[PDB]
């Protein structure tokens, strides 16, 4: 039915209605606490929402099985290695589960019409969101489920390519065991999709491609002086 390991990963999933409410409240109070003289721009609010999204990802990781056993230095190295990929994967899965045609479901728990955000976003960001939507559609066609999602998330987080980790053994172990569990799970639960395991893994390079697009966009905003100082996403980029 379900591998013990996957069940344990799932126990660490965030409380989504709580995260949604928390981020929504933060963004509301931020606008509120600002006087008419200092109201935040659209990009400004996008940046704050993105920061909060990444804060919640870090919070998730910190409390998660396996990751919580690592020294803070190793935790930073893993997150530094995959932060943009986790942001994209989080966004994509949110759309897989909650998305409606013509709309984007935000981390705040709200649907926004796609044409509205795309009008504000411009060509570059619209291209990125469109790429992400094609992956959403692909994952839906594959019948991507939450068990597979959490496996991919841990594979992204515990990546072999992380440099200078002290406890690399955990990366080795998580990689070996989560790949094995994902295979067992997909073969058991989706017997009619004989290639599902490999098809899910092949989405990871695509997630990485979208994350590069995101980093590029962020970097050009930063070159333009548009990204506020100590925005976490730009701090992650600065490395």
């Amino acid at each position: 039915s379900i591998p013990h390991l996957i069940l344990e990963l799932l126990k660490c999933e965030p409380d989504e209605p709580q995260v949604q409410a928390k981020i929504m409240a933060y963004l509301q109070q931020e606008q509120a606490n600002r006087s008419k003289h200092e109201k935040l721009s659209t990009f400004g609010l996008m940046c704050k929402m993105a920061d909060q999204t990444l804060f919640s990802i870090v919070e998730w990781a910190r409390s998660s099985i396996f990751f919580r056993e690592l020294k803070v230095d190793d935790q930073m190295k893993l997150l530094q290695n995959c932060w943009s990929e986790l942001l994209i994967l989080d966004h994509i899965y949110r759309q897989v589960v909650h998305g409606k045609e013509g709309s984007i479901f935000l981390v705040t728990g709200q649907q926004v019409d796609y044409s509205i955000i795309a009008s504000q976003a411009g060509a570059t960001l619209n291209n990125l969101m469109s790429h992400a939507q094609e992956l959403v559609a692909k994952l839906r066609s594959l019948q991507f489920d939450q068990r597979e999602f959490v496996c991919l998330k841990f594979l992204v987080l515990f990546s072999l390519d992380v440099k200078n980790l002290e406890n690399f053994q955990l990366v080795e172990g998580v990689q070996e065991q989560v790949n094995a569990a994902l295979l067992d799970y997909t073969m058991c639960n989706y017997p009619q999709q004989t290639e599902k395991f490999g098809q899910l893994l092949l989405r990871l390079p695509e997630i990485r491609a979208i994350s590069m697009q995101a980093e590029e966009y962020l970097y050009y905003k930063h070159l333009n002086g548009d990204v506020p100082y100590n925005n976490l996403l730009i701090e992650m980029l600065h490395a």
């Binding site: 804060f55 803070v72 930073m76 701090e235 600065h238």
Partner: peptide, 11 residues
Amino acid sequence: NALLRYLLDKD
């Protein structure tokens, strides 16, 4: 990356 360390260490 000071902010990241803070997020991981606080509380």
